[PDB]
């Protein structure tokens, strides 16, 4: 229902290996479409998704050109947040940044996203209202001062509702055929056990997209489910995902717990046991 | 890569006429396409600017359209003034946004009505250190180089007395040689004509 | 379609 | 420069078997700095074939990457994952189990 | 107050030298420009800065370089003077890279490089005064003035009317006329008019100057030749009541 657009920009100075690298990479949903790379012999944007590839010569271009600029610009960046943080330059930092628009389930525009960080700190962001910022720091500060002036934010606008909007929409419907896939998940039981009067028990998932996905061992609705071990999704590689939980039963309680599967492709709600 | 072109290069419009002046341009993502005006001497007048997204825009007597399907823009001047005479220039921004890819103009001639036609030719004092001037000519009248043969003539020009409502077309025609006083110098072409003589 | 807005600190 | 700990986790994407090709990988998450040096080991050999990700980072400005390369898992099932991070005093090491 | 200063407004060099062109604004816009024109060319993209510390080439780079140290200036420097330079150069400045906001220019730099400083030569203005046929005829004083043998083009004329600039009745040339036609050097000359009530001009009392503001060298800059250095001079010239 919800369909995001976001654009991924890393920069990091790497004193006496190279000049900075900036990374931009574009992901529409959770699934990747561009990618930019200053450390690439010819540095372009290359397709990661197979319906941008039917674009022509001047969307890639475009984009390349902004790239290519947004390396030069992010470089002094990082040395201005040298100057205000007061740190030494042949110092390795990292600049990061997020932004992008999210789309409503009428096709209208929901939210808008420009969110900032140095070193892994938010350093700035721009509010839900698209014409204030947030700054962390004191520095930051100084930095919200410069784009209040230039009319930063005011330009971020223009983008936020109406090429993002414009071009998600596009996006969509040329890969709806994957973007809207929904591909549903699978369920493997297991149970590995210390069998000191203890065992542990996995309830796993595999192969679904959107990364969505909640799996709870609720134990037959007993006061108790936080005992689990849960464990991030992990990448198949497969381009399909995977995920498994885990709990340690004391012997004596095989099938008293009850797994909790969720996933949007799942329309009815699974509850599978061994 | 990027190329504008403001076809015509010239125009010549009485006064009062409504005029357009057009640009062609490739269409992009988005962009902003920008109309100035080049004085002589005082460098770009920003007009008006037009957005990708937009499709037409008013300021006053000028009015701006975009048609991105066709790649091309009109400005619209009604009420043509004297004064609105300069070089118009068109400009569309680059795909990244680092610069104004600028048409190499069109340039306004807007004619003044010339209420009451008397041509005539009159001479003054330039001995000291032969100077004529040709003047209330007519709105058709032009000129000539005079052969570039060490004699000096320069182009047409129009001063306003709003004090008379009063509009002359001026000319200026001169030589350190006295041999000749006051020769038209105009192209041969001094049979079609019933101007004031120049002799003092 | 990235922003072509430049954000100077 | 925050320090987080990278996060291990080498798990096959297609189910263990015995003599037939698999994929192993080795997902690293939560880790910032960026810089960080990934290797999988056979027998504590280092397998000199391994394609990795490109590298892109989550909503909590953590970098994630994955690497993966072709590996026949067989009952002797000795397989590893050796990474070195800033934060890493000492380079870690985590062994491949089919399952447990 | 507001707008983008270009200094200076017109400058004479000869080839090899060295010279900064001066931009500058206070309406804190992040993108800076600089722009050539030549005829039959149009204006042309010299260099651009995105913001401060940031600068790329243009369309036409070679000969030039720019600094955008501050966000304030952004200067252009010709390293070493050609002919070819010679052209009218604008600096344009804008928010950033947006669609939303437009440029604005400034007044332009007409700049002329020459090969001999020798050839530089101040206007010699002169005023004539009306015809008495005109008189009966019109109704009316034209007023003629003419400067001769002045290089470079970097002049301008006005007609001040007593203590005042008059703008009411004149018209100065467009664009000047080469007293020789085909050749670089030769000496530019221009012709301007002022047309008044014949009342004015019959009576006696009322000052009226053609004057010409002349840009040319500076006491700092050397001339070994035994005419006056051709250095930025107004001739101005005077007429009074005559009947």
């Given amino acids: 229902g919800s369909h995001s657009m976001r654009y991924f920009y890393t920069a990091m100075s790497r004193p006496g290996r190279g000049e900075p690298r900036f990374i931009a990479v574009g992901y529409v949903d959770d699934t990747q479409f561009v990618r930019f790379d200053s450390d690439a012999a010819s540095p372009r944007t290359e397709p990661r998704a197979p319906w941008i590839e039917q674009e022509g010569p001047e969307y890639w271009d475009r984009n390349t050109q902004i790239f290519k600029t947004n390396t030069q610009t992010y470089r002094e960046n990082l040395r201005i947040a040298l100057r205000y943080y007061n740190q030494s330059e042949a110092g390795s930092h990292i600049i990061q940044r997020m932004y992008g628009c999210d789309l409503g389930p009428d096709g209208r525009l929901l939210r808008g996203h420009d969110q900032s960080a140095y070193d892994g700190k938010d350093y700035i962001a721009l509010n839900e209202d698209l014409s204030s910022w947030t700054a962390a720091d004191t520095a930051a500060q100084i930095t919200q001062r410069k784009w209040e002036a230039a009319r930063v934010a005011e330009q971020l606008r223009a983008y936020l509702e109406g090429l993002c909007v414009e071009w998600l929409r596009r996006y969509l419907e040329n890969g709806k055929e994957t973007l809207q896939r929904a591909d549903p998940p699978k369920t493997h039981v297991t149970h590995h056990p210390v069998s000191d009067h203890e065992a542990t028990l996995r309830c796993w998932a595999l192969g ?38 885990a709990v340690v039963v004391p012997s004596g309680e095989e099938q008293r717990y009850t797994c909790h599967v969720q996933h949007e492709g799942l329309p009815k709600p699974l509850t599978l046991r061994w | 890569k990027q190329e504008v072109t403001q076809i015509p290069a010239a125009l010549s419009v009485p006064e009062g006429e409504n005029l357009v002046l057009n640009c062609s341009f490739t269409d992009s993502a988005i962009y902003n396409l920008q109309w100035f005006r080049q004085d002589p001497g005082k460098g ?100 000539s180089q005079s052969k570039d043969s060490d004699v000096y003539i320069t182009d047409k020009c129009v001063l306003d007395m709003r004090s008379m409502d009063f509009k002359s077309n001026s000319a200026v025609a001169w030589s350190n040689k006295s041999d000749f006083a006051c020769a038209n110098a105009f192209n041969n072409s001094i049979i079609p004509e019933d101007t004031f003589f120049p002799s003092p | 379609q990235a922003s072509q807005e430049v954000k100077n600190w | ?94 062994k491949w189990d089919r399952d447990m | 107050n507001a707008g983008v200063t270009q200094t200076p407004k017109f400058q004479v060099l000869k080839t090899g030298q060295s010279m900064t062109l001066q931009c500058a604004q206070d309406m804190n816009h992040e993108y ?97 005064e009306p015809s008495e046929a005109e008189i009966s005829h019109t109704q009316k004083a034209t007023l003629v003035c003419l400067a001769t043998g002045f290089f470079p083009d970097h002049v301008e004329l006005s007609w001040w009317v007593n203590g005042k600039e008059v703008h009411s009745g004149v018209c100065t040339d467009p664009q000047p006329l080469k007293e020789q036609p085909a050749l670089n050097d030769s000496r530019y000359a221009l012709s301007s008019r002022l047309r008044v009530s014949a009342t004015f001009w019959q009576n006696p009392r009322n000052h009226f100057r053609c004057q010409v503001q002349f840009y040319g060298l500076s006491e700092n800059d050397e001339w070994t030749q035994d005419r006056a250095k051709p250095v930025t001079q107004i001739v101005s010239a005077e007429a009074w009541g005559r009947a």
């Fill in chain 1, 208 to 245: 679904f997209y959107p990364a969505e996905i909640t799996l709870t061992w609720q134990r037959d609705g007993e006061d108790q489910t936080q005992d689990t071990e849960l464990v991030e999704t992990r990448p198949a590689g497969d381009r399909t995902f995977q995920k498994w939980a």
């Fill in chain 2, 44 to 143: 770009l007048t920003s007009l008006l600017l037009i957005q990708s997204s937009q499709r037409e825009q008013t300021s006053g007597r000028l009015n701006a359209s975009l048609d991105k399907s066709s790649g091309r823009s009109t400005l619209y001047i009604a009420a043509s003034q004297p004064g609105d005479s300069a070089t118009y220039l068109c400009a569309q921004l680059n795909q990244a946004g680092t610069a104004l890819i600028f048409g190499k103009g069109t340039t306004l001639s807007v004619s003044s009505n010339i209420q009451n036609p008397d041509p005539a030719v009159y001479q003054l004092r330039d001995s000291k250190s032969s100077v004529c001037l040709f003047t209330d000519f007519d709105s058709q009248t032009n000129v």
């Fill in chain 4, 1 to 94: 420069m925050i320090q987080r700990t990278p996060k291990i986790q080498v798990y096959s994407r297609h189910p263990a078997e015995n003599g037939k090709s698999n994929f192993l990988n080795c997902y690293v998450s939560g880790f910032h700095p960026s810089d960080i040096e990934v290797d999988l080991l056979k027998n504590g050999e280092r397998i000199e074939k391994v394609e990795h990700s490109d590298l892109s980072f989550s909503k909590d400005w953590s970098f994630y990457l994955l690497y993966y390369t072709e590996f026949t898992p067989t009952e002797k099932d000795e397989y590893a994952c050796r990474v070195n991070h800033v934060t890493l005093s000492q380079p870690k090491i985590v």
């Fill in chain 5, 32 to 128: 800076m420009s600089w722009y050539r024109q030549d005829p039959g060319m149009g204006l042309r993209l010299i260099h651009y800065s995105v913001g401060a510390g940031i600068t790329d080439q243009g369309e036409v780079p070679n000969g030039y370089n720019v600094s955008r140290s501050t966000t304030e200036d952004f200067p252009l420097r010709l390293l070493s003077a050609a002919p070819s330079q010679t052209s009218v150069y604008f600096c344009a400045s804008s928010y950033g890279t947006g669609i939303n906001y437009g440029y604005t220019f400034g007044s332009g730099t007409r700049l002329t490089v020459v090969e001999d400083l020798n050839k530089v030569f101040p206007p010699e203005v002169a005023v004539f």
